[model samples]
Target: AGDAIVSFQDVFFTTPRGRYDIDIYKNSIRLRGKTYEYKLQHRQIQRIVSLPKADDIHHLLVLAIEPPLRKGQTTYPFLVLQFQKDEETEVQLNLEDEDYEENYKDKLKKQYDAKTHIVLSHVLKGLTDRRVIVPGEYKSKYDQCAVSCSFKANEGYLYPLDNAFFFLTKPTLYIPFSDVSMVNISRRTFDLEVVLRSNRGSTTFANISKEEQQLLEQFLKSKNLRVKN
Candidate 1:
C-alpha cells in the first residue's frame, strides 16, 4: 500500500463562528467540526476513531416509525457511506472474510462481544418500502456526495430495544459527531446549505448566525421550501 492514503473531511466554516480542521495521516482522516470531531480509519473503513455518548446517541430517534411497527418488525435505521469524489466511495468489503462479522460487530458492541443488533443488507428493499437505497451515479454540491443504508434489528442484532427504532423523515437522520468528514470554508459567503452528498444523507451540523438564517429564509422561499429547524 505504498500509494498515498489520501484523507479528507467534509466540512464548512461560518463567519465569526470558527475554523475547521481537516486531518490527514497514516492511520486515518479527521474532520474536526465546531461542535465535535468525526474521525474515520483508513485501514478499517467502518470503524470510528472515537466518539462521545455513542451508545446514547445510537438509540436516540427524533421521530418514530409511521403506524408504529411492532417489535420484531425490525429496528436499526439504515447506514450510508457516501463520498464526495465518486459513488465508489461506497466501501465494499470482502464479504468472504470469515472474521468480517466478528470484527464489524465488535465496533458497535460494548463488552463481551455484545454485537450490533441489526442485519446488514446490500438490498435496501428488505427494510425500506420506498427502495430509495440505490447507487449514486454522480456527486454534486449541497451534499457533493453521500452513501446511505438501513438495517433491521433481530435476535442477533437487537440486544434490548424491543420496542424502539431510529427516526424516519425527508432529511433522514443526521448525527454530526459520528458521520461527517471534510470541511470547506469560504470568506465570500455566510449563507450555506451543506449536504453530505446529492440528496443522499449523513449526520450533519450547521453553524449559522441569525443574519445568515435570515438570508437563508429568503433563499428557501425562492425555492418553495421553507427553512425550519
Candidate 2:
C-alpha cells in the first residue's frame, strides 16, 4: 500500500505537493446524489490526455444546391384579314404563283426578284402593321374586337420573313395551311395561318398542333396540301 495502485474502473487522479496516500473509498459521498455528480471538490482528477483533431475542410456549399434552367413556351400563328368599312386601312389578299418563271427575267434574276418581293412584303408587314397594330391592350374586350393576330407558321424555308421580297431562284414553295384558303377574320382586323411541315425529308415552318387545331376544317384541305384554292 506504499506503492499506491488503485483504480475502480478507469479512475485516474493525479496531484502533488501534499503528503497524501490513496484513501478514496466512495459508495455514497453524495450530498444528495441521484445520478451524475461532479463539482470537482478541491480538484484532483484529470485524465483527458489528448483528443480533438478532425476538420480537413471540404464543403462547396452543397455544390451550390443545383437546379436551374427553365424557359419554354413557343408557338405562333393566327391572322386572317378581310374587312373594309370606311377603311382607315383594310386589306384582304391571297396570291400564289408557281408559274412565274420566264427564266426569271435578268439582272441576275432581278436580285432574286427583289428577294421574292421582300418575302411578300414581309408577310404583309407582319400581318398588316407589325404584330397586328396592337393598342387596344393586346386582346380583351371580347378577344379585342376579335380582329385576330398570331403567327408562327413557317416554310419558304428559314423565312423569319427573310426579307428581299422572299428570295427565290426557283422556290415559291407552298404548304402553309396548305396554301391557306379564304380565311377571313377581320371584324376589327387580323388572322394569319401559315404552316408547311415535313421535317427531315426537308420542308419547314411547323407550329400547328393541338391536334392541328382539331381538324380545323380538315386542316384546310387543298387536296390536303397540294394547295390551290
Candidate 3:
C-alpha cells in the first residue's frame, strides 16, 4: 500500500471559498483548500461516516476527529464533506488501473454513481489499511437483556467499533456513543445498564463477567461518555 495515493476533486476550490482537493494517502488524509492544506494523520481520526447519494446529492462523507491536543474536551469534533449533484468531478485513479474499454467503468457507472463509489472505496480502503477504524472483537453476552420492564434472556456478540457498539442477536442493535446519555454499572451483581436518549429508551445487560464489565466501562468512558456507579 505504499505511495498508492487516491485523489478526489471538489470543484468548490474553483469558487472563492469552494474549491478543494481530497488526497487520500495510505496513512493520512490531506485536504487542500483555498487558504490552507489540512493534513490529518490516521491516528487523529476517530471515525468516518459515509452516506449514500440522496436528494440530488452525489454523496456525503464526514470525518470525526479525536479531541484536539490541549483542548481537554471529551466530545469528538466533526468535519463535513458533501458532494452535491451536478457538482462532482470525475474521479482520478492510477494510470495502470485505467479501464480503456470502459467496460468495468461503464458497469459501475450504470449501477451507481461511479465517481462517488470510487471515492468511497478508496477512502475506506485507505483508512482500513492504516488501521484507523479497526475491526471489533467478540465478547461474551449477558444472560439476559432487559429493556423496559420486560426481561428476556439472550445470547449475542458485542462488537465495539470506532464509533459505535453493536449487539448481534435476535434483534440486532447499534448504539452510538454520541447518543448515549448515561451508563450505570453494578459491580456487585456484574450488571451493566445503558441509558440512551428519551426515544431510544434503555437496555440492561445482566450477569456479565467482571472483566467484560470493566472493558465495557473503560471503552465507554474513553469515548467521554458518562458512567455512573
Clash number for each model: 26, 22, 5
lDDT of 1 by residue, 1-229 (tens): 1221222234222211234344433354454556755443433332111111122333211211233222234432222222222112222332334544554433321112111111121111121222222212222123222212222221111110111111222333323312222222222122233334344553322332333434334433443332333
lDDT of all the models against the reference? 0.27, 0.21, 0.51
By lDDT, rank the candidates, best first. Answer: 3, 1, 2
State the lDDT at 61 in candidate 1. Answer: 11
Query: On residues 40-135, what C-alpha lDDT tens digit does candidate 2 reach at each position?
Result: 211121111110111212100000000211112421111111111111212212112222133212111111122221322233232222221211
As for lDDT, the candidate ahead, 2 or 3, is: 3
Steric clash pairs (candidate 3): 12-18, 12-19, 13-18, 13-19, 13-20
Q: Write one digit per residue (lDDT tens) for candidate 3, span 7-85.
A: 6655342112345676766467676766656666767765555432223344445455665312123232555455653
Worst 10 residues of 2 by lDDT: 57-66
Query: Evaluated with lDDT, which candidate comes out highest?
Result: 3
Instruction: Name the top TM-score candidate.
Output: 3
Off by over 4 Å in 3: 1-4, 11-18, 52-58, 67-76, 85-92, 95-113, 130-229
